[PDB]
Amino acid sequence: PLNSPNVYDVTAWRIKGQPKVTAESDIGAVINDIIADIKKRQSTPETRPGAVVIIPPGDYDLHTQVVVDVDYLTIAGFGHGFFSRSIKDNVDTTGWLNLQPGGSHIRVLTPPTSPQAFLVRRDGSPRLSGIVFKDFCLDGVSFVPDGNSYKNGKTGIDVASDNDSIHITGMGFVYLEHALIVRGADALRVHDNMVAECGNCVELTGAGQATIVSDNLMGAGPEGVTLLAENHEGLLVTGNNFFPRGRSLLEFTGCNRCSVTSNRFQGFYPGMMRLLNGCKENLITSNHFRRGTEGFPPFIDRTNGLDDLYGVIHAMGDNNLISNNLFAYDVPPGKIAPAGAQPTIMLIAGGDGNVIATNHVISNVDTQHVVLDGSATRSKVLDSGAASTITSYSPDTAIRPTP
Amino acid sequence: PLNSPNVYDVTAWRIKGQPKVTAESDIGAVINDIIADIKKRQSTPETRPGAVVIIPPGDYDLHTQVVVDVDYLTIAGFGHGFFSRSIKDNVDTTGWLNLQPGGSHIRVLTPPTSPQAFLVRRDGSPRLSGIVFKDFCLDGVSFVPDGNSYKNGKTGIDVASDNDSIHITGMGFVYLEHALIVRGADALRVHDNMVAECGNCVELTGAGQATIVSDNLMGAGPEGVTLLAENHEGLLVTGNNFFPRGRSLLEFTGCNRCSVTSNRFQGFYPGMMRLLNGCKENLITSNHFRRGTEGFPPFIDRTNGLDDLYGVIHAMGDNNLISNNLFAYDVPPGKIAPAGAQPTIMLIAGGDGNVIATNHVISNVDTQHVVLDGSATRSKVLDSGAASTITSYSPDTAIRPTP
């Protein structure tokens, strides 16, 4: 294709001894054989620049899990190929000109014994570095036992060992229980992807540093996360459009000194944003939050099991700045839990020194813009509603009502 | 080029029955023939993954409108090829080493009755999904009757059918009356494009959902729009650099629960930002606004017909938050209209519950930072200027002057 042995076309690669295996029959087997060829040629720590695996547009079955254990592997297609399998699965499709996702289309047909399509893992040293996934489609094909479960035990990309400077861009993920998992992410960029109709979209697990999640379209399922970060420092979440129907849109546990700025959040359940287990010194600013109710009939009675006192934002931690956000709450009074409750927009569930400043709230019913738990200390609430919209169970909250 | 029938090189493709037609002579005919080949091979609703059309760098004439009616079509070049035809058309080009745009360079030479270079449209179902335009140049070549009219009736890309997950990235648009139009956009991304010296840059028409317009350079002409959205819900506009000389830089009509955050706006006329016809619950925050005067001699006496009482931001609708913006106004007193008037920076033209908070204004003349129309109800103006810079003709506006 190019005059370099480090450029692979999955549609041109023949597996020695298995002449019937094609990218169409098992792209997993073809890419593992390509990686074996890389490891054969690149055999010292000063001769391992990696390679690019090109996936032309087409339909490819993946039966065999790909183990990515080399630095600077690029897996690159020519399109994210996103298609709403959720709408297809729930309407009359008579006369429809297309019935599945496309582009550089990998159908994830992994067994339960190796359920991640791409397992990015190296035992040993150093951190896996500079791996790129871009411009292709990972499709779990079906949920179990029906299209509305958001369950199938399949993962698109699982990075399971400490990693540096990974770049996930221009991807499409659809109908995976877990689209993308990255554990121990250092200097990760999840940028300009379509991650929708997955049980869970992006899970940043274990710990992380200096990460950017930007310019993504994401929608998850009601038992799953849209974006989750665990023990991240300096994660920046910006320019994302998060839409239903994750249990949450943004969930941090033990994340400190992170920034969630300039995003759009639309959810159908309480607890769209959760800062859990002592999140400290986070900036939650310049975001648009819309709490609505489900319009799509197959999900109308589906819930994340939380009531409207949980908060649109539910925060437990110290010295977070929740500022300069707009909250638009519109839930029919008969869909509010418990019956006759004032919904909570921002709940300070616990912690010291949290500051809520310049937030504009619109609701169709009487709401508490801010509730602060009895355990909250040295809280500040400025210009985020009339006195009558701010509930401090804590005796020491300083409150400036909107004039 | 690759071992897939779904990868096309426009410079290698021969049209059966028209053997002398090349990408150089009519790339539109070549791409139409390629799309016919895709539809011949991809002949069932479960065998349509689409294809990539590759445009090497070069000068290509497009005479025949391309009709894109297949899902997951990627059209990709290797460069946006942007060149200022505006400077070229208006100065002495003696000894100039280049006189036109380049990269993957499509000269748009469409007939007046089929003027859009790319018409993206399908009659039937489902929505066209996952189409990608990237990394090429669409050039309208000339404006008529002269280079400064911003008129030629040509469009770069016109999406005229309901669409899902379209991605427009790394493009160059120049000297088109309309660069990009997208009707009924759902989960659209207009990302990291150069759209400049077009009459109109980006028109998001009809209605839309869950769209991101991010990281673009845009500049339009005095009778057209830079970014227009009509009846959008959850549109996120972030990281854009909007420069002159559109009639407006951002124009929303009937848009609700949208966000315009972390952009740079430079305009030479009033009405740089317009929220029109009852826009509700939009966040307008963390933007830099610069109102100046035309410095390029060919356009010095051009106007958009609006006076300085119209506003840098003109807002008509309910419950918008306009916060944490900087406005730098510098217009020679002789060019301010009406004669001797104080320019208006933010005009609330009408609507209920709008909040203006924490805005810094600089002006070379005495200005009203905020004017509220008499018809505005339950408005708040916080820390957006001294009492002498806020005019509320509405009697129920709550004003906290900057201390």
Place this chain on the structure above:
Amino acid sequence: PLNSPNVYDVTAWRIKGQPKVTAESDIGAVINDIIADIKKRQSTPETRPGAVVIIPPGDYDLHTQVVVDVDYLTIAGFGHGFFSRSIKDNVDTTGWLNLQPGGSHIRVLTPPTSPQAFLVRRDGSPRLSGIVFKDFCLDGVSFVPDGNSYKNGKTGIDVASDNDSIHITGMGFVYLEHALIVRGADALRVHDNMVAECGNCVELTGAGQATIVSDNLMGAGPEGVTLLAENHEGLLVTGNNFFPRGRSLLEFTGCNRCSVTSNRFQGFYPGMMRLLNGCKENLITSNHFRRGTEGFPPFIDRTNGLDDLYGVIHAMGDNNLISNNLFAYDVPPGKIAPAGAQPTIMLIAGGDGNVIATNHVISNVDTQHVVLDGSATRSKVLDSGAASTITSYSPDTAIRPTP
């Protein structure tokens, strides 16, 4: 590879009469020969659409400086190939599977008399236009006399003449004294790059207009700048993750009407953000600032020579809005300079009309959240700390303490 003479593969291109000069031995010489071939074929101002130079993954030595003097040259690899040479140089690498960066990997081995790998420069008109550098790695290989000096006199990309619509995206820069310098930038985009372990990351010198620096990961060295801009107008800095250890993370000199919004800033020294020499009318909003101390043993005793009274933000100029930011200051008393001093978070060193509004500061010791020099005029401090945390030596500062 494709049926166009404007598509070059550096691994396929042979220099006629120099068969020993390959991409591997001197990719500089190869690309210079490709540019001579472009110039020979594209011989008139109406036949210069430019070309693409494709860099497959591999290890390539660059001994000869590349002179880019043609419009619409795209130089494109398949991977940024980033690897921490800094960690590699300072820890036990026994059993390490990789010891250097990779991807589309250019080892910069330039002579001291032509030290920039890529010099983008043209004498004559018009401005160089539409040049693209994407998806490859520029590696300076070593700092001298040891890995921790940040010194080698090498530059990755130096744009030395006036330019329009340049695009730098998906790049990796490592172990260069200067990664990227762009003089006289007009409509430049530095987007989604990895620029780390360089003495200086991005220097926007001379003057500039309408530029975007977005979605980058950047880390410099203690004598150098992360992002520098000189006399820029309408620069937008957004979505970036700036980490240590530059002298500063953002340094503006004489920049006016620019915007720094929705970024993450982590530094180990005072003066993380500097608005120097009369910066006017800039927006600094919705940013996360973290001032910490060096944790990586090899750099523990390194400093940028400034004391803790300099400021996390140091501003000298008029009418800047510094609002809606979070500052997390944690420096052990034994590392504060001078010993026993009260650190300053935001210093207004001078100028007229600066506004500081809605800033949340956390500090491990008592700090002055805001200090205004005696020379400051018409300053506003709103909701950026209790009265005991704001010090105005200027008599005309209006202060509203946080309630």
